[PDB]
From a paper:
pmcMHC class I molecules bind peptide antigens and present them to cytotoxic T lymphocytes (CTLs). We herein demonstrate that human leukocyte antigen (HLA)-A∗24:02 and HLA-C∗14:02 proteins, which are known to bind conventional long peptides, also have the potential to bind N-myristoylated short lipopeptides. These HLA class I molecules shared a serine at position 9 (Ser9) with Mamu-B∗098, in contrast to most MHC class I molecules that harbor a larger amino acid residue, such as tyrosine, at this position. Thus, we concluded that the structural flexibility of the large B pocket of HLA-A∗2402 and HLA-C∗1402 primarily accounted for their previously unrecognized capacity to bind such chemically distinct ligands as conventional peptides and N-myristoylated lipopeptides.
In this respect, we directed our attention to a pair of mutually related allomorphs, HLA-A∗24:02 and HLA-A∗24:50, which possess Ser9 and Tyr9, respectively, while all the other amino acid residues are identical. Peptide-induced complex formation was also induced for HLA-A∗24:50 heavy chains (indicated with an arrow), confirming that the refolding capacity per se was comparable between HLA-A∗24:02 and HLA-A∗24:50. In sharp contrast, Myr-GANF lipopeptide–induced complex formation was reduced markedly for HLA-A∗24:50 (indicated with an arrowhead) as compared with HLA-A∗24:02. Indeed, a crystallographic analysis of HLA-A∗24:50 complexed with the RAGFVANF peptide indicated that the aromatic phenol side chain of Tyr9 protruded into the cavity of the B pocket, which may cause steric hindrance if the myristoyl group of lipopeptide ligands penetrates deeply into the B pocket. These lines of structural evidence support the initial hypothesis that Ser9, rather than the Tyr9 residue, is more favorable for lipopeptide binding.
Residue numbers in the entry:
A (entry chain A): 0 to 276
B (entry chain B): 0 to 99
C (entry chain C): 1 to 8
């Protein structure tokens, strides 16, 4: 595809009175998950979730296991620090989420990097786009920001994101080339569903596509139907492809005023669909 | 702490045709916090061998999960997904509609 | 290949 991403997603959830926090880590290349770690699982190892990652030698699995376990410990500590910063009790359950990653172009060049945290579902701290300073969302987060400024955490993360992250992504793309580079276009069709004598639903379907990025829109007389479109979230089929549909309620007899529009990287050209009885 | 209610979609991997094996999906997304209960029902009863994807989250930090199982649809059998989350007064049941 | 994180 024209650009690619490598992303890791970390979730810690405290369990007061039931031991250490639940810690789940998942790694993705674009929309394809390739590793996982789960503190509840018996192996206590980073585990493969895509076939091409099993091409990695044993050094890899040992090293990635060491890092994700160290990460779990740090975010465990992080949950505690946050309780103190926010003056919250030890009785409540809380969530700490962390994401990082890099985007690179099809030319192999770095586009952007991310390194950011959320606490109980709200932005806590994030590396800004220029990778040189931090967006801290509230008073607590300024303490962390001052701490990370003094230790030059931004420079360490910039070096990681522009270096190892990109190197890793390129290597994964090579090893998983046969699947990771595909841009399968959506198979599209439209269905018609009468609601009454006055109205019917037109539903535009996109099926079998990868990557998940897609634009599915309705127009009426060449005009955006943004505030009258029912648009579901892009959803996994389970077999490595994605699905989406968009629908509009149209007055009987007015079907031909409507067109469905489909943009997807796999398409030679954007699609315009009409109801063809 | 922010709280967001799950979006719930129930759907087959492939277009259903009665008698042909397929996969029944329940995709729950946009929710927070992450603890959630999800059952696939066949005629009101919990299906047993149901698997799900590893917990992950979107740009806005809300979580998403895919629950799935093999199945062979018929003309008669009703399927549904039942979801409980702290944002819900009572469990939410969404019936499988083969046209959705 | 993952990076690292720091304490709050
Ligand atoms: Zn116009």
């Amino acid at each position: 595809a024209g650009s690619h991403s490598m992303r890791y997603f970390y979730t810690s959830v405290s369990r007061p009175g039931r031991g250490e926090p639940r810690f789940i880590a998942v790694g993705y290349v674009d929309d394809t998950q390739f590793v996982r770690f789960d503190s509840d699982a018996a192996s206590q190892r980073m585990e493969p979730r895509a076939p091409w990652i099993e091409q990695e030698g044993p050094e890899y699995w040992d090293e990635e296991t060491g890092k994700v376990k160290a990460h779990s410990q740090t975010d465990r500590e992080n949950l505690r620090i946050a309780l103190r910063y926010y003056n919250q009790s030890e009785a409540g359950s809380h969530t700490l989420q962390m994401m990082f990653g890099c985007d690179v172009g099809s030319d192999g060049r770095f586009l952007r990097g991310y390194h950011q945290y959320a606490y109980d579902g709200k932005d806590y701290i994030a590396l800004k786009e220029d990778l040189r300073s931090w967006t801290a969302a509230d008073m607590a987060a300024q303490i962390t920001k001052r701490k990370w400024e003094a230790a030059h955490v931004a420079e360490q993360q910039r070096a990681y994101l522009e270096g190892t992250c990109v190197d890793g992504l390129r290597r994964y793309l090579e090893n998983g080339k046969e699947t990771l580079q595909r841009t399968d276009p959506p198979k599209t069709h439209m269905t018609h569903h009468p609601i009454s004598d006055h109205e019917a639903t037109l539903r535009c379907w996109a099926l079998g596509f990868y990557p998940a990025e897609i634009t599915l829109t309705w127009q009426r007389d060449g005009e955006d139907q943004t505030q009258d479109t029912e648009l579901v979230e892009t959803r996994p089929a389970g077999d490595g492809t994605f699905q989406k549909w968009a629908a509009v309620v149209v007055p009987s007899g007015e079907e031909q005023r409507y067109t469905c529009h489909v943009q997807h990287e796999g398409l030679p050209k954007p699609l315009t669909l009409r109801w063809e009885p | 702490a922010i709280q967001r209610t799950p979006k719930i979609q129930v759907y087959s991997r492939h277009p259903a045709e009665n008698g042909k094996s397929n996969f029944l999906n329940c995709y729950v997304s946009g929710f927070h916090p992450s603890d959630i209960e999800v059952d696939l029902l066949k005629n009101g009863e919990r299906i047993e061998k149901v698997e799900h994807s590893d917990l992950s989250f979107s740009k806005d930090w809300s979580f998403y999960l895919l629950y799935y199982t093999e199945f062979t649809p018929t003309e008669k059998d009703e399927y549904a997904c039942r979801v409980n989350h702290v944002t819900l007064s009572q469990p939410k049941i969404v019936k499988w509609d083969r046209d959705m | 290949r993952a990076g690292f994180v720091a304490n709050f």
